[PDB]
């Protein structure tokens, strides 16, 4: 499912 | 001759030379409270006596060797010493504060206390309050504000003792210095874990930690935590 | 100072073995036990001293 995945902290970092 | 020189924290000196020892200027010249060697050197010239501070005997002295960034004990300040077994360390704390400063030495056990009282006679700036530290409300009269609180009590509930004493007598932005023994609190787990819990406990008691320092090789499983008391 | 420690430790071992010899002199019943490593020790019988 990693194609659709979203991680907040990774997005927060960049 | 030995070249006595300044050190970071005022009131502390290092007798640099062939023998390098931490020393403090003697409040009462001509005697040693626990048999420590005494060094006198002339400066423009007048001779001034200094006492040797043995790290293996005073955990605070082990703190200096470790190189604590900041000490709230300094000349011209009031200090509250909890767990003052005798004059082994209180006398040295009395030296750094100087005649202007005062030291409140708190102790519970009777037999070391009579030793403390005899030492307090030689040092006017030491107010010996042999009393149980768990109940600071008893000896509130004899203590005013204190700029710094030094605690050497080896108890499992010591953090409570510092909180109770700190709330009553410690200045805002005032000082707290704690000496921790891991084995007394929890011998099952390693020393580092025990130190982590104590730091967390102090934070809940409105004390921000600033520094932590293990005292090896002078002592095993011991560390000193230094924090600042923010009431706000 | 380090040399002093070595001298003290050497003296401790000498004093220990001499006491072990003195115990053999004193009254009692004893058996020598020799380990596979070759160390020789004595175990006394469980007899109360009068």
């Amino acid at each position: 499912e990693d194609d659709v995945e979203y991680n907040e902290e990774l997005d927060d970092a960049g | 001759k030995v070249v006595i020189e300044p050190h970071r924290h005022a009131g502390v000196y290092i007798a640099r030379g062939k023998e390098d020892l931490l020393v403090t200027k003697n409040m009462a010249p001509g005697e040693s409270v626990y048999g420590e060697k005494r060094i006198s050197v002339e400066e423009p010239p007048t001779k001034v006596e200094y006492r040797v501070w043995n790290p293996f005997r005073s955990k605070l002295a082990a703190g200096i060797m470790g190189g604590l960034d900041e000490l709230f004990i300094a000349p011209g300040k009031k200090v509250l010493y909890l767990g003052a077994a005798s004059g082994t360390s209180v006398s040295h704390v009395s030296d750094v504060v100087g005649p202007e400063g005062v030291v409140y030495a708190v102790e519970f056990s009777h037999r070391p206390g009579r030793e403390l009282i005899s030492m307090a006679k030689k040092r006017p700036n030491i107010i010996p309050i042999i009393e149980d530290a768990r109940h600071p409300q008893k000896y509130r009269m004899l203590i005013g504000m204190v700029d710094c609180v030094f605690a050497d009590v080896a108890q499992p509930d010591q953090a409570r003792i510092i909180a109770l004493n700190s709330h009553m007598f410690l200045k805002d932005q005032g000082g707290v210095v704690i000496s921790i023994k891991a084995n007394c609190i929890d011998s099952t787990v390693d020393a580092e874990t025990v130190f982590a819990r104590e730091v967390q406990k102090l934070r809940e008691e409105r004390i921000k930690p600033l520094e932590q320092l293990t005292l090896e090789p002078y002592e095993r499983d011991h560390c000193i935590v230094v924090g600042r008391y923010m009431r706000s | 100072v380090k040399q002093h420690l070595q001298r003290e430790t050497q003296l401790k071992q000498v004093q220990q073995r001499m006491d072990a010899q003195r115990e053999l002199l004193k009254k009692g019943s004893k058996k020598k036990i020799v380990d596979s490593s070759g160390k020789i020790s004595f175990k006394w019988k469980k007899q109360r001293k009068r």
Binding site: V4, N7, D11 | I185, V189, K201 | -
Partner: protein, 374 residues
């Protein structure tokens, strides 16, 4: 629903907790063998260190009280210990007696549970060997031993008059021990009356309650479900198996428009779309606190995630049969506790804070609430 007060025991990790009869002191068992008494008589939120009982080398796995005078603790060395906790007595904080259970040969032995029986003045203990032993408290000796279970006895409980002692453990069985008969009471002899198999897996927690209108023996364990029985009619009375998940607070929502199901569990949100069902997106949140509630706008573009600590709103954009996630910043929501959140329209929301301060946000307009009589 928040921690009123965190208090550290000044000892090793906690294994067992128990309160005395007068309900003014807590006994806390530790991994390093210590038993700490904490005073709570001060008031709500007040916990003060009272005393440390005599120390020992075995882990304290369980604790029970006899009135307010003695603290009975099961240990990990296969021994039951009685400490004296009575004040004004020279024996305060000392270890009066040590009792030892039969120890398994090829395994360690642990005393998982101990309970005090006021009527017969006995201690009932369960150990890892599957035995239930009844001890005479005054003399600290064994009165009876029952080899009942085939595995560990993890919990014990008793009725109000101590006419029944119920045990349970890994073998999934609940054994009833009875002393109701008059001759049994005179001779003080317990009996392995009966047993029942009701659980699919281990039984970790058991409790008993009786009143003029109630009679419950509630048990639960690894099966993740409650099982209820009647203490008086345990052998023959009916039982109820409660549902595993009973959704009083919904963890899943459905959006009629765009055909979306959203489920949130343990700081992770999954979104599916149905025409056959595809997982369009998963949302992972850093915070440790579990998500309390999630509300989705009628359009489905705006997703609000609420926790007791903070509330975060994330905008969803459908791209390539997948949802793109962006975190819209709204500082007021971030500092706001969100017990319940609902949508007025595609833009406006209502939030009921943990303090019951209801207010409206546009993406605060507080609303008056009638005062409730105490």
């Amino acid at each position: 629903g928040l921690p009123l007060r965190n208090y550290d025991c000044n000892s090793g990790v906690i294994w067992s907790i128990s309160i005395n009869d007068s309900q003014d002191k807590l006994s806390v068992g530790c991994d390093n063998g210590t038993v700490v008494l904490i005073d709570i008589s001060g008031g709500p939120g007040v916990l003060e260190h009272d005393t440390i009982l005599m120390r020992q080398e075995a882990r304290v796995l369980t604790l029970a009280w006899k009135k307010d005078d003695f603290v009975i603790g099961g240990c990990s060395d296969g021994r039951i210990r009685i400490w004296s906790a009575q004040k004004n007595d020279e024996n305060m904080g000392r270890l009066l007696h040590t009792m030892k259970v039969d120890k398994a040969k090829k395994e360690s032995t642990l005393v998982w549970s101990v309970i005090y029986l006021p009527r017969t003045d006995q201690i009932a203990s369960g150990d890892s060997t599957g035995s239930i032993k009844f001890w005479d408290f005054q003399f600290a000796t064994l009165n009876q031993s029952f080899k009942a279970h085939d595995a560990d006895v993890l919990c014990l409980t008793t009725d109000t008059d101590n006419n029944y002692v119920f045990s349970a453990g890994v073998d999934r069985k609940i054994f009833q021990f009875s002393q109701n008969t008059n001759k049994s009471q005179k001779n003080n002899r317990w009996v392995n009356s009966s047993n029942r198999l009701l659980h699919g897996n281990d039984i970790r927690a058991i409790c008993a309650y009786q009143s003029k209108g109630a009679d419950f023996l509630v048990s639960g364990g690894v099966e993740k479900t409650l099982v209820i029985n009647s203490l008086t009619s345990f052998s023959n009375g009916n039982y109820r198996k409660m549902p595993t998940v009973e959704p009083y607070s919904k963890n899943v929502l459905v959006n009629k428009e765009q055909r979306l199901v959203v489920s949130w569990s343990e700081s992770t949100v999954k979104i599916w779309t149905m025409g056959n069902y595809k997982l369009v997106c998963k949302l992972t949140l850093k915070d440790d606190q579990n998500i309390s509630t999630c509300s989705l706008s009628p359009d489905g573009q705006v997703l609000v995630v609420g926790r007791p600590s903070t509330t975060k709103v994330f905008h969803l954009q459908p791209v390539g049969n997948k949802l793109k996630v962006t975190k819209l910043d709204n500082d007021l929501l971030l500092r706001t506790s969100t017990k319940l959140v609902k949508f007025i329209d595609n833009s406006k929301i209502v939030i009921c804070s943990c303090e019951d301060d209801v207010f409206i946000v546009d993406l605060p307009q507080e609303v008056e609430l009638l005062e409730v009589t105490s």
